[PDB]
Design a protein around this ligand. Structure first.
Ligand SMILES: CC(=O)OC[C@H](N)C(=O)O
Ligand SMILES: CC(=O)OC[C@H](N)C(=O)O
Lengths: 8, 308, 308, 8
């Protein structure tokens, strides 16, 4: 899972 | 047509019509995987650096620093291509199998173990704090050169390849750069009143909540590249006509179907974008509408994820 | 410019000039990684199927069968894109981390454990034997549609992007399709007497040995995609002007340098091709010569290999 | 290592 700016 | 370095060869990505989605071929996709470092972010990696060069904040000597993953890889290759040192802050955790890739591009990852973005942005800022004269943080979530490049390339490519017949643009939002620049191009530069559709996870629908004036409650989700859990500055709400939400599982399954049924090597958020476009496309409203969908990245960035 | 399916969007790959190789920018590279399934083989995946459709051997119902990895992935997406079942024979072994990828494209891998190509080609043939009416093997090593597509796309792209100024073409040989079609295009269709350079591993220099009329002794090597250990039919010796050999380690290191110094996400044989072009390029003979190098694939196909 | 048609 991704959340809050990470993964972008 | 020979590019001085890999950064200048950004864009010119193709439109492929889908056969197993939408209705009588009204859904077509833009393969952003076909860029120098293989995601849509290659375009902003290039233009954020160029603009920083142009306005003097980036120069020979100064090191690019930032927190980010597709954007990291984009900045990685532009750094290498143009001769910059670069530090990219990242946690220990998710969005991994990418270390040796960024390591392979000569990046020096700040091995930052509370594993999340603030932990990096803190270290980003702290690094940024340590020596302002030596570091430059390009700030993708707010840097106007992000939407500007899509305004100048991504959007005009869509207009030309459809010959002004695009009626709808469907795109996941991470920075909002993609949909913002594209919309501006088509609506303002070419003057066509299309429908711009932002896509976000149902698990973290902060745009849907904001526009509704509801409590903004973000959450964890699997759709890498979108769903930042806040409204980013590079997201121009004013041009957004509609917001569709899509769940992680459906997004993943849509990505698998893109491979197996369409022979299109798409990444996870490409599935999210398609699932939302398919939904719109099956509304009689959009039956005579040409729907253009941004497929942000490609399958092989996702080998070690739930997609496989 | 909207392609009916992913197969029609093949090619149109860019030329990027190198800064850390050759002499005063006389070495430029063609990024074949920027194709629908991300290797140069996408072009032959498309055209081998189209031609088989055109001459009636491939039809609705019949299953594509073959032994191959980039070619497998190319046929995989074309099968999916055009609606064919496909069986791809492969060992248990090397060139792996690719199972779930091919599996992800809906291929059914013949789980063939003597792990090598004959073991597959036997099973390929045996499958092919079982029911001639149901199976079609497209035979990349000899199928003329392989070089033909490069004659019609890869070569003309090179001519146009250089405006007839290419003087040298450097390309690794697997099928020989790439160099054969390209040479024919430039030399015969446009009429320019360029130097075509085949590249092969020093570990298995069967072309160098053949032309010398020496004992043909092939061997194992790490440069995936080239060095088949025999002279393939799709390799037209007649147009070959020169053969350069390159060792696995140098090839790998050249690939790493392509990432770190040029910001170009190249695969292993792309490093082999560059190492040979750099050598040629530093000969005063080739100082005023424009050298074009085929970079067959991209880095992320190689995550689990010695390249990383 | 690769050899004989495999890897292509
Ligand atoms: C473990 C975790 O969720 O970290 C929080 C971080 N801000 C992030 O969402 O990236
Ligand atoms: C183990 C092995 O070398 O197998 C032999 C096979 N013909 C091949 O080279 O692919």
């Amino acid at each position: 899972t991704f959340e809050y700016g990470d993964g972008i | 047509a020979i590019y001085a370095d890999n950064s200048y060869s950004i864009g010119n990505t193709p439109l492929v019509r889908l056969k197993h989605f939408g209705h009588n071929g009204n859904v077509v996709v833009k393969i952003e995987g076909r860029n120098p470092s293989y995601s849509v972010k290659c375009r902003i990696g290039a233009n954020m650096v160029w603009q920083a060069e142009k306005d003097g904040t980036l120069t020979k000597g100064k090191e690019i620093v930032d927190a980010t993953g597709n954007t990291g890889i984009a900045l990685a290759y532009v750094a290498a291509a143009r001769g910059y040192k670069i530090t990219l802050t990242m946690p220990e955790t998710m969005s991994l199998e990418r270390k040796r890739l960024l390591c392979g591009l000569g990046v020096n990852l700040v091995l930052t173990e509370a594993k999340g973005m603030k932990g990096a942005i803190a270290k980003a800022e702290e690094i940024v704090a340590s020596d302002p004269s030596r570091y430059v943080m390009l700030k993708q979530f707010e840097n106007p050169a992000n939407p500007q490049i899509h305004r100048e390339t991504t959007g005009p490519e869509i207009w030309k390849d459809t010959d002004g017949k695009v009626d709808v643009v469907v795109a996941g939002v991470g920075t909002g750069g993609s949909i913002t620049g594209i919309s501006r191009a088509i609506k303002l530069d070419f003057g066509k009143q299309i429908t711009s559709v932002a896509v976000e996870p149902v698990e973290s629908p902060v745009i849907s909540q904001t526009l509704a004036g509801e409590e903004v409650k973000p959450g964890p989700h699997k759709i890498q590249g979108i769903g930042a859990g806040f409204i980013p500055k590079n997201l121009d709400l004013s041009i957004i006509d509609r917001v569709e939400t899509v769940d992680s599982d459906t997004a993943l399954a849509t990505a698998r179907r893109l491979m197996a049924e369409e022979g299109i090597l798409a990444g996870i958020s490409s599935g999210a974008a398609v699932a939302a476009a398919d939904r719109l496309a099956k509304l009689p409203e959009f039956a005579d509408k040409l729907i253009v969908v941004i497929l942000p990245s490609a399958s092989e960035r996702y080998l070690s994820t739930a997609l496989f």
